[PDB]
Structure 1
C-alpha cells in the first residue's frame, strides 16, 4: 500500500467530485421522464464516493507493478471521460452528446478493468463494481433520451 500513490489518485478524483458539487441535480433533472428502475437521489452520491476510493485503491496497486503503463493509460482515459460526463448532461443538458461520452467512458472502464486483471486480480476486482455502475449510467442516459425524445435537449 503506497500512500503517496493512493493520495494522488484520490486527489485526481477531486475533479469529477467537483463537477457533482458544483452541478447538483436540478428541477430540470427531476422533471425528466425516468425509467421505473430509477433509484432514489441518495444512491448516486454514495455510489460515486465509493467508486472514487475503490478505483484509487486499485490504481495504486497497479502503479507499483512492472508493465503497468498501458493500464494507467486506460485509467487516465476513463477518469477524463468520467470528469466530462456530468457537465455535458447536467450542465449543458446535451443528452445525446452525453450518451457518447458515457459510452466512451464505459469502454475505457472495461479496458482498465481488463488491463488491471492482467497484472493484479484485486485491482481488477475493485473495478468490477465500476463497470457495473457504468452500465447503469449508460442505461440511464439512454432512457433519459428515449423517454424524453419530445425535448430538443434529448436529440
Structure 2
C-alpha cells in the first residue's frame, strides 16, 4: 500500500523540523544545565527523531489514502508545526517556559493524530505510539530542565 509521492511529501515536510535540529545543536549552555537523573545521552536524540520522522511519514501516507482522512491530516499538520516550533524556542531563544507550553500543545496534537489515525487504520495508529511516548519524554525533559534550573532567569 506504498504511495511514494505521498510518503516523500510527508518526509520532505519533516525536513523543516529536521533543519531546526541541524542549525541549533545543543552547546554547553545545554551541557551546563542540571539534567534529570534519567537524562539520555546526546546520541539518542538524532536516532529517535530520524526514526520518528520516518514512522510518522509512513503513518501519514497510509491515512492520506483513505476516505474521511481530513480531520486526521489536520491534526497531523498541527503536531508537525509545533514540532518545528520547539527547538528554536528552547535552544535558539532559551525560552524554557514558553517551550514547555509548545511541547505540551504538540503532545496534545500528537495524541489527537494517533487517536484519529486509529479510527481509520490500525497500523498508522500503532506507528504513532512511539511518537506519543517520545513526546511524553520530551515534555518531562522540558519540565525537568526548568525545575532543576529555576535559579536561571531563562527558566522562569
Regarding TM over 0.5, the answer is: yes
1:42-67 C-alpha deviation (Å, 9 max, x unpaired): 00010000000000000000000000
Cα distance in 2, alignment partners of residues 40 and 80 from structure 1? 26
Confirm or deny that 1:116 pairs with 2:117.
Answer: yes
Cα distance in 2, alignment partners of residues 23 and 35 from structure 1? 21
User: In the alignment, which residue of structure 1 is the partner of 2:53?
Assistant: 52
Count of matched residue pairs: 155
The TM-score with structure 1 as length reference comes to 1.00
Cα distance in 2, alignment partners of residues 25 and 126 from structure 1? 28
Cα distance in 1, alignment partners of residues 27 and 112 from structure 2? 32
Deviation at 1:25, TM superposition (A): 1.0
User: In the alignment, which residue of structure 2 is the partner of 1:131?
Assistant: 132
Matches within 5 A, 1:27-106: 27-106=28-107
Deviation at 1:39, TM superposition (A): 0.6
1:66-104 C-alpha deviation (Å, 9 max, x unpaired): 000000000000000000000000000000000000000
1:17-49 C-alpha deviation (Å, 9 max, x unpaired): 000000011110000000000011000010000
The structure 1 segments of at least 4 consecutive aligned residues displaced by more than 4 Å after TM superposition are none
Q: What is the Cα-based RMSD across aligned positions, in Å?
A: 0.3
The TM-score with structure 2 as length reference comes to 0.99
Cα distance in 1, alignment partners of residues 58 and 68 from structure 2? 18
1:88-141 C-alpha deviation (Å, 9 max, x unpaired): 000000000000000000000000000000000000000000000000000000
- Give ranges in structure 2 of 5+ residues lacking alignment: none
